[PDB]
Design a protein around this ligand. Structure first.
Ligand SMILES: C=CC1=C(C)[C@@H](Cc2[nH]c(/C=C3N=C(/C=C4\NC(=O)[C@H](C)[C@H]4CC)C(C)=C\3CCC(=O)O)c(CCC(=O)O)c2C)NC1=O
Ligand SMILES: C=CC1=C(C)[C@@H](Cc2[nH]c(/C=C3N=C(/C=C4\NC(=O)[C@H](C)[C@H]4CC)C(C)=C\3CCC(=O)O)c(CCC(=O)O)c2C)NC1=O
Ligand SMILES: C=CC1=C(C)[C@@H](Cc2[nH]c(/C=C3N=C(/C=C4\NC(=O)[C@H](C)[C@H]4CC)C(C)=C\3CCC(=O)O)c(CCC(=O)O)c2C)NC1=O
Ligand SMILES: C=CC1=C(C)[C@@H](Cc2[nH]c(/C=C3N=C(/C=C4\NC(=O)[C@H](C)[C@H]4CC)C(C)=C\3CCC(=O)O)c(CCC(=O)O)c2C)NC1=O
Ligand SMILES: C=CC1=C(C)[C@@H](Cc2[nH]c(/C=C3N=C(/C=C4\NC(=O)[C@H](C)[C@H]4CC)C(C)=C\3CCC(=O)O)c(CCC(=O)O)c2C)NC1=O
Ligand SMILES: C=CC1=C(C)[C@@H](Cc2[nH]c(/C=C3N=C(/C=C4\NC(=O)[C@H](C)[C@H]4CC)C(C)=C\3CCC(=O)O)c(CCC(=O)O)c2C)NC1=O
Ligand SMILES: C=CC1=C(C)[C@@H](Cc2[nH]c(/C=C3N=C(/C=C4\NC(=O)[C@H](C)[C@H]4CC)C(C)=C\3CCC(=O)O)c(CCC(=O)O)c2C)NC1=O
Ligand SMILES: C=CC1=C(C)[C@@H](Cc2[nH]c(/C=C3N=C(/C=C4\NC(=O)[C@H](C)[C@H]4CC)C(C)=C\3CCC(=O)O)c(CCC(=O)O)c2C)NC1=O
Ligand SMILES: C=CC1=C(C)[C@@H](Cc2[nH]c(/C=C3N=C(/C=C4\NC(=O)[C@H](C)[C@H]4CC)C(C)=C\3CCC(=O)O)c(CCC(=O)O)c2C)NC1=O
Ligand SMILES: C=CC1=C(C)[C@@H](Cc2[nH]c(/C=C3N=C(/C=C4\NC(=O)[C@H](C)[C@H]4CC)C(C)=C\3CCC(=O)O)c(CCC(=O)O)c2C)NC1=O
Ligand SMILES: C=CC1=C(C)[C@@H](Cc2[nH]c(/C=C3N=C(/C=C4\NC(=O)[C@H](C)[C@H]4CC)C(C)=C\3CCC(=O)O)c(CCC(=O)O)c2C)NC1=O
Ligand SMILES: C=CC1=C(C)[C@@H](Cc2[nH]c(/C=C3N=C(/C=C4\NC(=O)[C@H](C)[C@H]4CC)C(C)=C\3CCC(=O)O)c(CCC(=O)O)c2C)NC1=O
Ligand SMILES: C=CC1=C(C)[C@@H](Cc2[nH]c(/C=C3N=C(/C=C4\NC(=O)[C@H](C)[C@H]4CC)C(C)=C\3CCC(=O)O)c(CCC(=O)O)c2C)NC1=O
Ligand SMILES: CCC1=C(C)[C@@H](CC2=N/C(=C\c3[nH]c(C[C@@H]4NC(=O)C(C)=C4CC)c(C)c3CCC(=O)O)C(CCC(=O)O)=C2C)NC1=O
Lengths: 164, 238, 177, 145, 164, 177, 177, 164
C-alpha cells in the first residue's frame, strides 16, 4: 500500500536511518495538498451508485458486440458482474485519494490483472473506455473543485495507463 | 606502414589502448572489493567455515577450474546478453550501495565493479541460497518454489543456457554434487548468532532489491526469508 | 524423478534381478499403446489455457465465498495466483501421463503442500473443488467425450488411459485433504 | 602548401620554388606525426577505416591500365625488399613507444591534418573527427604511394 | 529455437555430457514423425496466400467492432497491417512444421506478444479468432494426410494457448 | 545524483562559498515557479503510456525498414524491447524535468548507452526520431496545444518549462548519436 | 543455437519466404541419410576417451617443446587442462556433426577462445596440429578405416559426411588462428 | 427528404393522428442502424479527395472518345465540370448516410437528371461507370466495417439503378 508516508520510511529503513529533515518535509505534502484529494474521495463515495450505472451502459453502447452469444455480456448475471467490476475500481480511486498514493490500486487491481483478463477472454479495451467516459464527463466546478479535478483525473488515468 | 588488410605479414597495434587500460582498471577495481569482502569473511585471524573449497583431496583443484570455466562463459555471452548484464548490475548496485553518490558514480563507469559488488554484498551479509537453510517444510517448499522460478532464465525456450551448466568436462558435475550438500551442511551447522543474522538480513534484503512497495511481497518475505535469499538477479540463468 | 521405464528398475534391484520376459508383460504393451498416449497427451495441452479457466470459473459458480471480501480469491493478485496454479497442477499431470507414472508429483509438488495451504490461508474445501473439475474434464478428452469440441483421431478404445489420468489427479486430492 | 601557409610571404615562397613546398609538406607531417608511419589506430575498425583509404592511395600507385609504377617500388637490389621489410617493422614498434602526451598530441593533430587538407564536405569532417587514423592515411597524391 | 536436436544437445551441454544412446534415440523419432509434418509444409507454403485471405475477413466477420473509429481496424491501411500479421503467424507456423519444435513461434512470435498487443491496444481475442477459423476447417483427408492434420493443428492451438 | 537545488551546492563547493543572496535569487524563482513544474510533470505521465505508441509507431510509419524481415523492430521480441526503451527514456526525462536539472539523465540511462546501441545493431538515427516525436509531444502537452487532449490547468505563460524539457530531449539525441 | 533444419529457416526468413518445394528437397535428402548421421557420431563418441589421449600425446611425440621446463604442458594442472579443452572441442564437433550445422560451434565454444589462448601464451601452431590430429582420427572412424578398430556397421557410402566433419575441424582451426 | 422520421409523421399527418406507438418503434431502428451508417459516413468524409479522384478517371480511361470535338469532355472546363459532378454525387451519398434514408439523393441529385443530361448530351453510361467503379472498389474488412459496407453500397447502387 504505497503512499507518501510509506515510501519515505522504506527508504530510511533501507539505509538504516532515523527520519531526517528531508522526510519530514515530505509529510508536509500530506497537509496542504491533502485538502483537495480528501474532498474528491468522499464526494465520489457520496455519488457512487450514479457513476457506475451511467458509465457502465456507456461502455456497452460503445461495444455493442458484447451482447452476442459466445461473448462476455451475453446474459444478465455477467452484465451484473460487469457493474461490480466498475464499482470495484471507483472504490479504489476513492481508496487511493484518501491514502494519498497509488497504494490500493496496484496491490489489488493492477498486479496480476494482465493475466486474468487474458485467460477469461475479457476485453481490456472495454475496461479503459468505461473509465475514460467518466474522465471526459468531468465538469471542473460542478463535479468537484478545481484542484480536486486534477487529482481525480491524474489518479484515474493511472488506472488507464496500467491496462493500456 | 600499410595496414594489416593488404600486403602485410605480422600482427600490429601492440599498445595498451583506451579500452584495455579501462579493462585493467576494471579488473583491479573488481579485485579490490572482494578483498574487502573476504576481509569480512575472515574477520578475525581464523578463517570462516563458509569458504571451504571442498573436502575430498581432488575436490579442491576441481572446484577452482569449474568456477574458472564459469568466467569464460561470462565472456562467451552474446551481445544482447552482455548488454543485459550491464544495466541490471548498474541498477542493482545503486540498490546495493544505497545512498552514496560517490559509490554509485564509480559503479556507473566501471563495469566489472558492478559484477563484483552484487556478488560480495550478497556474500558479506550471506544472503545467498548456499548460506540459508529453511527450518520448516513450509519454508522448504516456499524456497523451492522461487528457486524453480529462477531456473527458467537458464532454459528460456527449453534449451538450457551456457550459464546453467555446472561442468564442462567428464566427472565435473559429481564434484559439484558433493560441494553443495557440503555447503548445505555447513549452512546447517552454523552458530546460534549466524542463522538469526540471515533471517533478518534476507527479509531486509528482499524488501529493497525486489519488493518496491508491494505489501504482499514483503509479507511473504517477513514470514519466509528463505525465499528472499533465493531471489537472485535476472542476469544469471540459475 | 522416475517414469514408466524406470518404474521396473526400482523394484527389481531390491531382489537384484535382470529384467526378463516375466517383467516385460507390461512394457511391451506400453509401446503398443505409445501412440495412443501421445495422441492423449497432445489433447490435454491443446485446450489447456481454456482448461484452466474452465476449472476455476466452475469452482466460483459452485461456491461464491471466495469472491466475498476477505475470501481467498478477492483481488487480481489472488485470482491470478490460481490462474497461475491452475496451470501448475495441470502441467505436472500432463507430465505424469507422458511419463506413464506419477513419480514426478510427490517429490517436487505434493510434498509439504498439504501443510502449506493452511498457513497461507488457502482454504481446503475449494482446493478439492478446484482439482475435481479437472478430473472430469480430463476424461472428456482422452475418450473424446467433450461435448463442445471434437479432435481428430484414429478410432479405438482408451479406457485404460482415461482412468489412468484420473488416477493421477486424486493423488493431488489425497495430498491436500 | 597554399592552405597551410601562415602568412602571405610564405605562400609566395611555396609558389616560386616547387621543391620547397614538397619538402614543406613533408616537414609539416614530421613536426606533428600525421604520417602513416607513426599512426597507430585504437580500435580494430579504426584500423579498417585506415585500410579503406589506403587502398585508394595504392590505386594511384599504378598507371591507368594497372601496370605497377616506378614510384611505389620497395626494393632495388636482391634482398632489399626483405631489407625494407625488416626495417619498417622496427619503425612501427617505435611508433608504439610514444608517450601519452605524444599520443594525445597526434590524435588531435591528425584530425586537424585530415579536416583542413582533405575535406570540403561534412561527412569527411565527421570521419576525421572520429577516426584520426583514417585522417592520417590520406596522402597528398604528389607521392605515388 | 527449440527442436528435437537443440534440446537434447542442450541437456548434453548443461551436464557437460556426450551424445549417448539416450540422445540419439530422439532424432530417430524425428525421422518417422518428420515425414508427416513435411507433408503439410509445402501444402501451406504454396497455398498461404489463400488461407490468409480466408482467415483475414473471419477476424472481422466475428468482430465487426474493429472497423469503428478509434479501434484497431479504423481505416483500410491499418486493416492492411492486420492481414500481414496473420501472414506472419502463418509463416512462423510453417517454420515450426519444419524444425519440429515450437521455436519459431516462441522466439519470434510469442515472446513479447502479451506486452505490445496490450500496449498498442490490439485485442488478442481477435487474433485467436483468426487462427481458430483456420483450425476447424481442416477437412483432414483433403488438405493433407490424417497424420499431418493432427500435427498442423497441434501448432495452431499453441498460438491459441500462448495468446490466452 | 544531483538536482536543481543541489546544482549550485557543488559550484559553491568548488569555490568554497557560502550560498549567498546573489546566487539564491535563481532558486527562489525556481521554487515560486515550481508549482507550474508540478503542473507539467503530471501533464506528461498521465498521457505517457500511449505517448510511446504515439512515437514508436510514428517511427515505424516514417521509417518502415524496422519492421522489414531481418529489421530491428521485426520480431515480437525486439518490438517489445523497443517499446520498453521508448518509455525508459520517458521515465527518465520526466525524472529530470521534475528534479529541475538533468543530472539523473546522463548517469543512469544515457551513460554507456551509445556503445550499447552500437553493439546491439540498433539504427541510431531512428532512435533520434523516436525521441524527437516524444520531444514534439512534450511541448504540445505542456502548452495545452495537444490537439486531441486538453487538460485543465491554471492559466498563464508556460513556455519556459516547454523549453526546459526540449533542452533535455536533445541531450538524449546527442549522447546516443 | 540452431540446427541444419533451422538454418534453412533463417535463410528463408530474411527473404520473407515460406519453405517451398525446391527447398524441401534438401531436407528430405537430409533425413534420408539421417540413419547414417546417427551411425556416424556413434562411432566417434564410442572411441572418444581414447581419441583425446591419441591426440594430445601425439603432439608431445611430434614436438617436445610443450614438456620443456616452463612449457605449456609442464604442470600436472596444465597438462590436465590441455586434456580438458582437448575433449571439449571434441565434444562440440560431435554436437555440430549430429546437428548438421556449425551453429553450436561459433557461439558456445569459439567465442573468445582465441584471445583467451593469446592471454596465456598458448602455442597456437601446436593447437593447429592438435585440432588436425583429431581430424585425421575422425575421418577414419566415420569411414570404418581405422587401423585398429573395425566396427559392426552397414555398408554404403559415407564420404560426404567425412568431409562434413573435415569442414568442421578447420572452422575450429581458423578461429584459433 | 424521405427519411425514417419524415415518413412516419407524413403518414401521421395524412390521417390526422398523433405520434402512434407504431412510430415510436421505427425510431428505435434509427438507434440500431446508425452506428453502421455514421461510421460509413465519417470514413467518406476524411477520404473524399482520394475516392473521387479515382472515380473520375475511371470514366476517362474507359471512354477516350469524350475528348473528340463536340463530345462531353472536349476542353478543360468540361473535364473540371466532370470531376465536380462526381464530387457532388458522393457528397449526397455522404448526406444520405447521415439522414438515414434516401432523401438527399433523389431531391438534390436524381430528380431532373434524366432531363438535364439528355439535353446537354452527357452520357448516362459514363456517369454509371464512375459510380460502379467505386462500388466494387470497396474492400470489406479493410476500408470500413462489415455492416458499414452494406449501408455505403446500398446508396451507391441506388444511384446506379436510378440513373440507368
Ligand atoms: C478486486 C477487484 C476485482 C475486479 C477488477 C474483478 C475482476 C474479475 N472479474 C471476474 C469475472 C468477470 N468480470 C466480468 C466483467 C466484465 N467483462 C467484460 O467483458 C467487461 C469488460 C466487464 C463488464 C463491464 C465478467 C463478465 C466476468 C465473468 C467471466 C467469468 O467469470 O469467467 C473475476 C472472476 C470471479 C468473478 O466472477 O468475480 C474477477 C476476479 N473482480 C474483483 O473482485
Ligand atoms: C512466496 C514468495 C513469493 C513472492 C514474494 C513473489 C516474488 C516474485 N515476483 C515475481 C514476479 C513479479 N513480481 C511483480 C511485482 C508486483 N506485481 C504487482 O502486481 C505488484 C505491483 C508487485 C508486487 C507487490 C511483477 C510485476 C512481476 C513480473 C515480472 C517478471 O518476473 O517477469 C517472481 C518471478 C516469478 C513469479 O512471478 O512468481 C517472484 C518469485 N512470488 C513468490 O512466489
Ligand atoms: C463527484 C463527482 C461527480 C461527477 C464526475 C459527476 C458525475 C455525473 N454527472 C452526471 C450528470 C450531469 N453532468 C452534467 C454536467 C455536464 N455535462 C456535460 O456534458 C458538460 C461537460 C458538463 C457541464 C460542465 C449535467 C448537465 C448533468 C445532468 C444531465 C446528464 O445526465 O448529463 C451523471 C449522470 C447521472 C446523473 O444525471 O446524475 C454522472 C455520473 N457528478 C458528480 O457529482
Ligand atoms: C564475502 C566473502 C566471499 C566468499 C567466501 C566467497 C564465497 C564463495 N562462493 C563460491 C562459489 C560460488 N558462489 C556463487 C555465488 C552465488 N550463488 C548465487 O546463486 C548468488 C548469485 C551468489 C551468492 C549466494 C556461485 C554461483 C558459485 C559457484 C557454484 C558453487 O557454489 O559451487 C565459493 C567456492 C566454494 C563453494 O562452492 O561455495 C566460495 C568460497 N565469495 C565472496 O565474496
Ligand atoms: C508427435 C506427436 C505424436 C502424436 C499426437 C501421436 C500421433 C498418433 N496417434 C496415433 C494413433 C492412435 N491414437 C489413438 C488414441 C485415441 N484415439 C481415439 O479415438 C481416442 C480419442 C484416443 C484414445 C486415448 C488410437 C486408438 C490410435 C490407433 C491405434 C494405434 O496406433 O495405437 C498414431 C499411429 C497411427 C498413425 O500413424 O496415424 C500416431 C502417429 N504420435 C506422435 O508421435
Ligand atoms: C512450485 C510449485 C508451485 C505450485 C503448486 C503453485 C501453487 C501455489 N500458490 C501459492 C500462492 C497462492 N495460491 C493461491 C491460490 C488459490 N487460493 C485459493 O483460494 C484457491 C484454492 C486458489 C485459486 C483458485 C493464492 C490466492 C495465493 C496467494 C496467497 C495470498 O495472497 O495470501 C503458493 C505459495 C507461494 C506463493 O505465494 O506464490 C504455491 C506453492 N505455485 C507454485 O509455485
Ligand atoms: C457456473 C459456472 C460453470 C462452468 C464454467 C462450467 C464448468 C464445468 N465444465 C464441465 C465440463 C466440461 N468443461 C469443459 C471445458 C471447456 N469446454 C470447452 O470446449 C473449452 C475447451 C472449455 C471452456 C473454455 C469440457 C470440455 C467439459 C466436458 C463436456 C464437454 O463440454 O464436452 C463441468 C463438469 C460437469 C458438472 O459436474 O456439472 C463443470 C462444472 N459448469 C458450470 O456450472
Ligand atoms: C514477425 C513477427 C511479427 C508479428 C507477430 C506482428 C506483430 C505486430 N503487429 C504490429 C502492429 C499492428 N498490428 C495490427 C493488427 C491487428 N489489428 C486488428 O484489427 C487485428 C486485431 C489485428 C490483425 C488481424 C494493427 C492494426 C497494427 C498497427 C498498430 C499501429 O499502427 O500502432 C506491430 C507494430 C509494428 C507494425 O506495424 O508492424 C507488431 C510487431 N508483426 C510482426 O512483424
Ligand atoms: C493449404 C491447405 C488447405 C486447407 C487447410 C484447406 C482449407 C481451405 N479450404 C478452402 C476452400 C474450401 N474448403 C472446403 C472444405 C470444407 N468446407 C466445409 O463445409 C467442410 C467443413 C470442409 C470439408 C473438408 C470447401 C467445400 C471449399 C470450397 C469453397 C468453400 O466452401 O469454402 C480454402 C480457400 C482456398 C481454396 O479454395 O483452396 C482454404 C484455405 N484447403 C487447403 O488447400
Ligand atoms: C536502464 C537503462 C536502459 C535502457 C536505455 C534500455 C535500452 C536497451 N535496449 C536493449 C535492447 C533493445 N533495445 C531495442 C530498441 C530499439 N531498437 C531500435 O531499432 C529502435 C530505434 C529502439 C526502440 C525504440 C531493441 C530492438 C533491443 C533488442 C535487440 C535484440 O534483441 O536483438 C538493451 C540490452 C538489454 C536487453 O536485451 O533489453 C538495453 C540496455 N533498457 C535499459 O535497461
Ligand atoms: C506515419 C505515421 C504517423 C502517426 C501514427 C502519427 C503519430 C504522431 N503524432 C504526432 C503528434 C502528437 N502525437 C501525440 C500523442 C497522442 N495524441 C493523443 O491525442 C494521445 C494523447 C496520444 C496517443 C495516446 C500528441 C499529443 C501530438 C501533438 C498534437 C496533438 O495531438 O494535439 C507526431 C509528431 C509530429 C507529427 O508527425 O505529427 C507523430 C509521428 N503521425 C504520423 O505521421
Ligand atoms: C500533487 C500534485 C500537484 C500539482 C499538479 C500542482 C497543482 C497546481 N498547479 C497550480 C498552478 C499553476 N499551474 C500553472 C501551469 C500551467 N498553466 C498553463 O497555462 C499551462 C497549461 C501550465 C504550465 C505548463 C500556472 C500558470 C499556475 C498559476 C501560477 C501558480 O499558482 O504557481 C496550483 C496553484 C493554484 C491552484 O490551487 O490551482 C496547484 C495546486 N501542485 C501540486 O501540488
Ligand atoms: C609419436 C607419437 C605418435 C602418435 C601417438 C600417433 C598419433 C596419431 N594417430 C594418428 C591416426 C589415428 N589415431 C587414432 C587413435 C587411436 N587409435 C585407436 O585405435 C584408439 C581408438 C586411439 C588410441 C587410443 C586412429 C583411430 C587413427 C587412424 C588410423 C587407425 O588407427 O586405424 C595420426 C595421423 C595419421 C598419421 O600420420 O599416422 C597421428 C599423428 N602418431 C604418432 O606419430
Ligand atoms: C545438489 C547439487 C547438485 C546437482 C543439481 C547435480 C548436478 C548434476 N546435473 C547433472 C545433469 C544435468 N545438469 C543440468 C544442469 C542443471 N541441472 C538442472 O536440473 C537444471 C534446470 C540445470 C541448469 C541450471 C541438467 C539440465 C541435467 C540433465 C541432463 C541429462 O542428464 O539429460 C548430473 C548428471 C551428469 C551425468 O549424467 O553424468 C549431475 C551429477 N549434482 C550436484 O551435486
Amino acid at each position: 500500500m504505497k503512499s507518501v508516508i510509506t515510501t519515505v520510511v522504506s527508504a530510511a529503513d533501507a539505509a538504516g536511518r532515523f527520519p531526517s529533515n528531508s522526510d519530514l518535509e515530505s509529510i508536509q505534502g500530506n497537509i496542504q495538498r491533502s485538502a483537495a484529494r480528501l474532498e474528491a474521495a468522499e464526494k465520489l463515495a457520496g455519488n457512487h451508485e450514479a457513476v457506475v450505472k451511467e458509465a457502465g451502459d456507456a461502455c456497452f453502447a460503445k461495444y455493442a458486440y458484447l451482447k452476442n452469444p459466445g461473448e462476455a455480456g451475453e446474459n444478465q448475471e455477467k452484465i451484473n458482474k460487469c457493474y461490480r467490476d466498475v464499482d470495484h475500481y471507483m472504490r479504489l480511486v476513492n481508496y487511493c485519494l484518501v491514502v494519498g498514493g497509488t497504494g490500493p490500486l496496484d496491490e489489488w487491481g493492477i498486479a496480476g490483472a494482465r493475466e486474468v483478463y487474458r485467460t477469461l477472454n475479457l476485453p481490456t479495451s472495454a475496461y479503459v473506455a468505461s473509465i475514460a467516459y467518466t474522465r471526459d464527463r468531468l465538469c471542473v466546478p460542478r463535479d468537484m473543485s478545481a484542484q480536486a479535478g486534477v487529482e481525480f483525473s491524474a489518479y484515474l488515468d493511472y488506472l488507464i495507463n496500467a491496462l493500456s | 606502414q600499410t595496414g594489416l588488410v593488404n600486403s602485410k605479414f605480422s600482427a600490429r597495434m601492440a599498445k595498451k589502448t583506451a579500452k584495455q587500460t579501462k579493462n585493467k582498471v576494471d579488473e583491479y577495481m573488481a579485485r579490490s572489493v572482494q578483498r574487502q569482502y573476504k576481509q569480512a569473511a575472515v574477520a578475525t585471524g581464523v578463517y570462516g567455515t563458509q569458504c571451504t573449497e571442498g573436502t575430498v583431496k581432488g575436490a579442491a583443484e576441481a572446484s577452482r577450474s569449474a568456477a574458472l570455466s564459469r568466467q569464460f562463459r561470462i565472456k562467451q555471452r552474446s551481445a544482447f546478453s552482455k548488454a543485459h548484464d550491464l544495466f541490471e548490475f548498474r541498477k542493482h548496485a545503486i540498490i546495493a550501495a544505497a545512498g552514496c553518490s560517490y559509490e554509485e558514480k564509480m559503479v556507473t563507469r566501471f563495469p566489472k565493479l558492478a559484477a563484483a559488488m552484487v556478488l560480495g554484498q550478497t556474500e558479506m551479509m550471506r544472503t545467498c541460497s548456499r548460506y540459508v537453510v529453511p527450518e520448516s517444510v513450509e519454508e522448504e517448499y516456499m524456497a523451492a518454489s522461487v528457486d524453480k522460478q529462477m531456473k527458467r532464465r537458464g532454459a528460456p525456450g527449453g534449451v538450457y543456457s551456457l550459464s546453467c551448466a555446472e561442468g564442462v568436462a567428464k566427472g565435473q558435475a559429481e564434484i559439484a554434487r558433493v560441494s553443495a550438500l557440503g555447503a548445505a551442511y555447513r549452512a546447517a551447522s552454523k552458530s546460534a548468532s549466524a542463522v538469526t543474522a540471515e533471517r533478518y538480513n534476507s527479509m531486509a534484503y528482499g524488501r529493497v532489491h525486489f519488493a518496491h512497495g508491494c505489501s504482499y511481497e514483503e509479507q511473504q518475505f517477513n514470514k519466509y526469508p528463505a525465499a528472499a535469499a533465493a531471489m537472485r538477479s535476472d542476469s544469471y540463468g540459475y | 524423478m522416475l517414469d514408466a521405464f524406470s518404474r521396473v528398475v526400482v523394484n527389481s534391484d531390491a531382489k537384484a534381478a535382470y529384467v526378463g520376459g516375466s517383467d516385460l508383460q507390461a512394457l511391451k504393451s506400453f509401446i503398443a499403446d505409445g501412440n495412443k498416449r501421445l495422441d492423449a497427451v497432445n489433447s490435454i495441452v491443446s485446450n489447456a489455457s481454456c482448461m484452466v479457466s474452465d476449472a476455476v470459473s466452475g469452482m466460483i459458480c459452485e461456491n461464491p465465498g471466495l469472491i466475498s471480501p476477505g475470501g481467498n480469491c478477492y483481488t487480481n493478485r489472488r485470482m491470478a495466483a490460481c490462474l497461475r496454479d491452475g496451470e501448475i497442477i495441470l502441467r505436472y499431470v500432463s507430465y505424469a501421463l507422458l511419463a506413464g507414472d506419477a513419480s514426478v508429483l510427490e517429490d517436487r509438488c505434493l510434498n509439504g503442500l498439504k501443510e502449506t495451504y493452511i498457513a497461507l490461508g488457502v482454504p481446503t474445501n475449494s482446493s478439492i473443488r478446484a482439482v475435481s473439475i479437472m478430473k472430469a474434464q480430463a476424461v472428456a478428452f482422452i475418450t473424446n467425450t467433450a461435448t463442445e469440441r471434437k479432435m481428430s483421431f484414429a478410432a479405438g478404445d482408451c479406457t485404460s488411459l482415461a482412468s489412468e489420468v484420473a488416477s493421477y489427479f486424486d493423488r493431488v486430492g489425497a495430498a491436500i485433504s | 602548401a597554399l592552405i597551410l601557409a601562415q602568412n602571405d610571404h610564405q605562400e609566395k615562397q611555396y609558389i616560386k620554388y616547387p621543391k620547397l613546398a614538397a619538402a614543406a609538406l613533408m616537414a609539416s607531417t614530421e613536426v606533428t606525426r600525421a604520417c602513416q608511419r607513426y599512426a597507430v589506430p585504437e580500435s580494430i575498425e579504426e584500423e579498417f577505416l585506415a585500410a579503406s583509404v589506403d587502398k585508394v592511395n595504392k590505386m594511384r600507385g599504378t598507371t591507368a591500365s594497372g601496370v605497377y609504377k616506378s614510384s611505389c617500388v620497395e626494393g632495388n637490389a636482391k634482398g632489399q625488399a626483405e631489407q625494407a621489410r625488416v626495417a619498417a617493422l622496427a619503425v612501427a614498434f617505435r611508433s608504439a613507444q610514444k608517450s601519452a602526451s605524444q599520443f594525445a598530441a597526434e590524435r588531435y593533430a591528425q584530425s586537424k591534418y585530415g579536416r583542413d587538407l582533405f575535406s570540403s564536405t561534412h561527412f569527411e569532417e565527421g570521419y576525421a573527427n572520429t577516426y584520426p587514423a583514417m585522417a592520417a592515411a590520406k596522402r597528398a597524391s604528389s607521392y605515388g604511394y
